[PDB]
Amino acid sequence: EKEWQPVTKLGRLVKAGKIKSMEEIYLHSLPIKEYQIVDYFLPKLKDEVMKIKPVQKQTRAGQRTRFKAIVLIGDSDGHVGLGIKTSKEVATAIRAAIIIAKLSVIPVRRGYWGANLGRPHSLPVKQSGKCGSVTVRLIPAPRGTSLVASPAVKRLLQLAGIEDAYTSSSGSTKTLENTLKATFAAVANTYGFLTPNLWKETKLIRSPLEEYADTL
Amino acid sequence: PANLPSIFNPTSADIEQLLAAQCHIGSKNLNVHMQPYVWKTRADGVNIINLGKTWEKLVLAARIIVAIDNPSDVCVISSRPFGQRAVLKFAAHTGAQAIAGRFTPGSFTNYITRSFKEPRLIVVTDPRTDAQAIKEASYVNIPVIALCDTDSPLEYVDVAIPTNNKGRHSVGLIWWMLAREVLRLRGTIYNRETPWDVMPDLYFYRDP
Amino acid sequence: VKKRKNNGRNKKGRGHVKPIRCSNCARCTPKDKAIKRFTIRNMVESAAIRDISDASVFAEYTVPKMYLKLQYCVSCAIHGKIVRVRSREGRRNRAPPPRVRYNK
Amino acid sequence: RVRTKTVKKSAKVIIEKYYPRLTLDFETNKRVCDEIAVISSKRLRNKIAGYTTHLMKRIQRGPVRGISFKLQEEERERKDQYVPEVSALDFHQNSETGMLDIDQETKDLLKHLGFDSIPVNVIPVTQS
Amino acid sequence: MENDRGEIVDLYVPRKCSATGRIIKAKDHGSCQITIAKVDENGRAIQGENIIYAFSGFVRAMGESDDALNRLAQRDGLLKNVWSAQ
Amino acid sequence: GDRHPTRSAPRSNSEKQASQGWGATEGEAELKDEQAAEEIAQTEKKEAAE
Amino acid sequence: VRTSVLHDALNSINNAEKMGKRQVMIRPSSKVIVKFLQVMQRHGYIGEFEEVDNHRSGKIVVQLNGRLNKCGVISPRYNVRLAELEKWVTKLLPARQFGYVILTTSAGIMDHEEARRKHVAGKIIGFFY
RNA sequence: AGGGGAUCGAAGACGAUCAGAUACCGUCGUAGUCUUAACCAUAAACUAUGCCGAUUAGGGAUCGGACGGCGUUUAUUUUUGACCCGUUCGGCACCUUACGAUAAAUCAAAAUGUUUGGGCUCCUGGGGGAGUAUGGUCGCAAGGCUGAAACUUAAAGAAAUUG
Numbered sequence A: 001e002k003e004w005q006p007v008t009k010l011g012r013l014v015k016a017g018k019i020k021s022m023e024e025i026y027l028h029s030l031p032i033k034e035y036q037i038v039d040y041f042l043p044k045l046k047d048e049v050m051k052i053k054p055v056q057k058q059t060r061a062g063q064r065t066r067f068k069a070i071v072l073i074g075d076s077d078g079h080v081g082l083g084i085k086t087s088k089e090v091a092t093a094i095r096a097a098i099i100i101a102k103l104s105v106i107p108v109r110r111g112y113w114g115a116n117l118g119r120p121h122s123l124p125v126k127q128s129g130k131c132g133s134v135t136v137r138l139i140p141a142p143r144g145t146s147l148v149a150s151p152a153v154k155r156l157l158q159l160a161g162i163e164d165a166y167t168s169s170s171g172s173t174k175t176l177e178n179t180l181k182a183t184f185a186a187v188a189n190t191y192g193f194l195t196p197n198l199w200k201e202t203k204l205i206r207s208p209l210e211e212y213a214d215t216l
Numbered sequence B: 001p002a003n004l005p006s007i008f009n010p011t012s013a014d015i016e017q018l019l020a021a022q023c024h025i026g027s028k029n030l031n032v033h034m035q036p037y038v039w040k041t042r043a044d045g046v047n048i049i050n051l052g053k054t055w056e057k058l059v060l061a062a063r064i065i066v067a068i069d070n071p072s073d074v075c076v077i078s079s080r081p082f083g084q085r086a087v088l089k090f091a092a093h094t095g096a097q098a099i100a101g102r103f104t105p106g107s108f109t110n111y112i113t114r115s116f117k118e119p120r121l122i123v124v125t126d127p128r129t130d131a132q133a134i135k136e137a138s139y140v141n142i143p144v145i146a147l148c149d150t151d152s153p154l155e156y157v158d159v160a161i162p163t164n165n166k167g168r169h170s171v172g173l174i175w176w177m178l179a180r181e182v183l184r185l186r187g188t189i190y191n192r193e194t195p196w197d198v199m200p201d202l203y204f205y206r207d208p
Numbered sequence C: 001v002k003k004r005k006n007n008g009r010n011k012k013g014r015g016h017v018k019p020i021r022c023s024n025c026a027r028c029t030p031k032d033k034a035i036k037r038f039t040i041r042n043m044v045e046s047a048a049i050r051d052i053s054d055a056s057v058f059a060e061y062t063v064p065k066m067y068l069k070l071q072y073c074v075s076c077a078i079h080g081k082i083v084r085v086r087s088r089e090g091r092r093n094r095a096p097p098p099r100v101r102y103n104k
Numbered sequence D: 001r002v003r004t005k006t007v008k009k010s011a012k013v014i015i016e017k018y019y020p021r022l023t024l025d026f027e028t029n030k031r032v033c034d035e036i037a038v039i040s041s042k043r044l045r046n047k048i049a050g051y052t053t054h055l056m057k058r059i060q061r062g063p064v065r066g067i068s069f070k071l072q073e074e075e076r077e078r079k080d081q082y083v084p085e086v087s088a089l090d091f092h093q094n095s096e097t098g099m100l101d102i103d104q105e106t107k108d109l110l111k112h113l114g115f116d117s118i119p120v121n122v123i124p125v126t127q128s
Numbered sequence E: 001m002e003n004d005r006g007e008i009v010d011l012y013v014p015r016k017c018s019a020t021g022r023i024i025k026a027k028d029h030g031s032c033q034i035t036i037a038k039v040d041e042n043g044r045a046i047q048g049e050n051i052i053y054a055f056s057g058f059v060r061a062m063g064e065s066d067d068a069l070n071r072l073a074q075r076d077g078l079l080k081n082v083w084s085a086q
Numbered sequence F: 001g002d003r004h005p006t007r008s009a010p011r012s013n014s015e016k017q018a019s020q021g022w023g024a025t026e027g028e029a030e031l032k033d034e035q036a037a038e039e040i041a042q043t044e045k046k047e048a049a050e
Numbered sequence G: 001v002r003t004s005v006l007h008d009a010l011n012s013i014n015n016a017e018k019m020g021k022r023q024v025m026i027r028p029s030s031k032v033i034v035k036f037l038q039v040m041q042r043h044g045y046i047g048e049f050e051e052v053d054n055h056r057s058g059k060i061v062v063q064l065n066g067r068l069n070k071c072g073v074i075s076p077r078y079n080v081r082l083a084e085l086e087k088w089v090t091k092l093l094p095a096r097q098f099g100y101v102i103l104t105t106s107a108g109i110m111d112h113e114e115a116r117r118k119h120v121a122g123k124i125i126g127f128f129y
Numbered sequence H: 001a002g003g004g005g006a007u008c009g010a011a012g013a014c015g016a017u018c019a020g021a022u023a024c025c026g027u028c029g030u031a032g033u034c035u036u037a038a039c040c041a042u043a044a045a046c047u048a049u050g051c052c053g054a055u056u057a058g059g060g061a062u063c064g065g066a067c068g069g070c071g072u073u074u075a076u077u078u079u080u081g082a083c084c085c086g087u088u089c090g091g092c093a094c095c096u097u098a099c100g101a102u103a104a105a106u107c108a109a110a111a112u113g114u115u116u117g118g119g120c121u122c123c124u125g126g127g128g129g130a131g132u133a134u135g136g137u138c139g140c141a142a143g144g145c146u147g148a149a150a151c152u153u154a155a156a157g158a159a160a161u162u163g
């Protein structure tokens, strides 16, 4: 509600504003642990809850039910994350789940199908992910083609900011949590594929943590 | 050379002390990743470490230590009793935070435990018995330096110093030389030729 | 689901082995799927020896202890409590139970 | 006939936070608590004081694992500077008749380094 | 490094491991950097110029960063008689 | 045995209708229930506050 | 028994890249593999390769430069038309802007993007990207 | 069909237990259990894991052959035998680990598969009806091999978690 007290060095430094933008934090692959960093260098984030699962768990005293909520966030311009949390009430679960999602947010590479004419629109390469008896495959597509996918996996792509793609899925796709996690892993690994246009050597620099001393 | 001058050499005087503390006798069972730091296997018994190799890796480890702006971002770990007093005196002569005894897993990952510190470097006395410390270093992007004999797992270990790692005199002497070399690079000793005014036996263990 | 990696018999590299008779029920079991017990027990207890010793036939001597070897099928074995059920992870451990040399 | 966490944690904090102000005496301890604490029962109040007097009785002879206080660190730090004048680890050939014992395998290593000038005794290694 | 008309539209150009060359992913906790200080003629460490190395979690997990560090350092002239291709 | 062989007449033990009678056991409805609880809570409080 | 030495060699290379080494040995030598290596070499996907010699099949040794991904082989020798090449490049390639399918023609063992320039066709052998 | 037929022991007779007990417990006991000359060709015939070939991680044990070495042991001795240390080829297995795989149990193969093609043979397509009916074929017989349809049904099933 009011001024937040940084508990980690990465948190105190950003509040001062010494670090320009999130991208460098990604460049140095640093762990984020406070959701105040993310929403400071990424405002205008929309969230949607897919569904809540009722689980008639355990017996001997009846069943003590817990509820599991799945939420995902994005800005439709290259940042997306997904988190899941369960609790004893839907309101408590949803709030805690959004926090977990904000922590998870990652960037997504976007490229061209054929020839480049500004404003990349699709994936650079084709890539796939697997999260247990379910695989999802995404391949590039030309302009004009919309997103071709099931409603669940389709919704994620707007939040990531992709315009053109073909999709394919195998295995038991009725497990919504497993399906969403596989798509998340697939879109994530696009920055791991070493394309021809990245062979050029880059120079190593010191991380922001080491450049300057912090404030008590 | 192109980066190191010729003043960084073993020097005869140091050699007697290091090999007097029984540092060339350790670990009959030969691990395959420590074979490069091996001179020759003794006839019908133990292996023999290459004492020359120690000196260059020791200076290399020292270069890592004197790189952080504030010396408070350096943690020195030890669990077994033989290397506890020595670690504590290191933290006093230089600037560093020390941990002797139990580690309390969660120190580097949980932000509500009372023993919570976020360092940028870790120095370990034995990777086998401090595996828990290394396991957590793998979560927050922090390199690891450790003293190792020839039998020791080397996952997530970036710099390895070959020593006895289990002797009474050996672990103390190595810590002393490393601390001395750090002060040489700093403006403390003021010269590579002048001797330092504390003797190695301070870095020992007392039974009661 | 396999419960044991060796199928509880310890035979790999042969067709079969000739079976044997359980020393309690007289059931038939293969020679390798059998609990075997070696025993070196005295003729009598120490208490008897003292009465035996006093009427010594020749000088001072001890009557030699006997040696036995018993073989059990598994169902009778765990009813007589020679061995008993272990835990999920304790199963895969083939070391003989340690014997205390001082017994507190 | 055994205390609980409530008394022990109350005892623990008082000794750690007000160490100089109290002593081994049981009634002086009894009084100080009622001024520095907020208790609502005479029996609980008495019990906390009793344990602290027991707790302080044992601290006087050796430090205990649970306790950690500001005075303790520096007072101990003073006593841990013992140094032997003989310097046993120092190369002992100059301080006794015999020199150092090594093996021929080690001897070659010095030759590779070139530090053959240093004099030390060499003993070959037997089978057992 | 996409170029529609010569400018860079990519969000950021990641790093590569110095021993294998794989791209260093985001959220890849396990990767580390090593900094070696530069000494002067009489032994002091000059402040503000430094050489940086990067290693990936993939090589780190096997436990081969040590041999990689010998090779990279021996190439840049920071050691002697410490690494060898037999 | 007082359990398995019921000695009364089966008369409309419909869990579906009971769900309506008690509370629907679905996550989606609960969110609406919480919104309604928030709406009702304020009006009661303001009357006491006034 | 050994039935495709080209596949054996390519399989060894792929293992090293996914395990991260910098060197591979290849036991059987042949023109097809040696020319196959050259097509990658002209594009930088590999480094320097050394050919040893003995009066036998002959070993090869190359050291891996990294920056190399899946390189496979199609075992049944298909027949490709000059028109049915967009089908194959759509079939097995991560993207259009890079990657190479390798053919065999009467003009020598070569790849596409130049077979299109030379207006030639033949049989498919492999691919690499 | 002969020979042989000690011991066990299908069928069977008695004794007990039991409300009944055509069984589990006891005493006998025929075919059989053995062998010669001919038939039968099925087994949870199980590693529930087809055969050939290449690559991929550390270790210590173990069987056979070869090689190198300081020693010991007792030999009409010395070479050799036998014990110790090490290297290598070929097998029956095991321990830690996952860079990898699978739904999981787990696996040095069950890996090198959505970034899918080394070579060749066989088998299955929800559960019952059913390894049944009919036809063919082999067999002295019991049976073996090949092998459907009408009809019926919304679940059967695998691995793991809490009671």
Ligand SMILES: [Zn+2]
Pocket (backbone or CB within 6 Å): C022, C023, C024, C025, C026, C027, C072, C073, C075, C076, C077
């Ligand atoms: Zn029995």
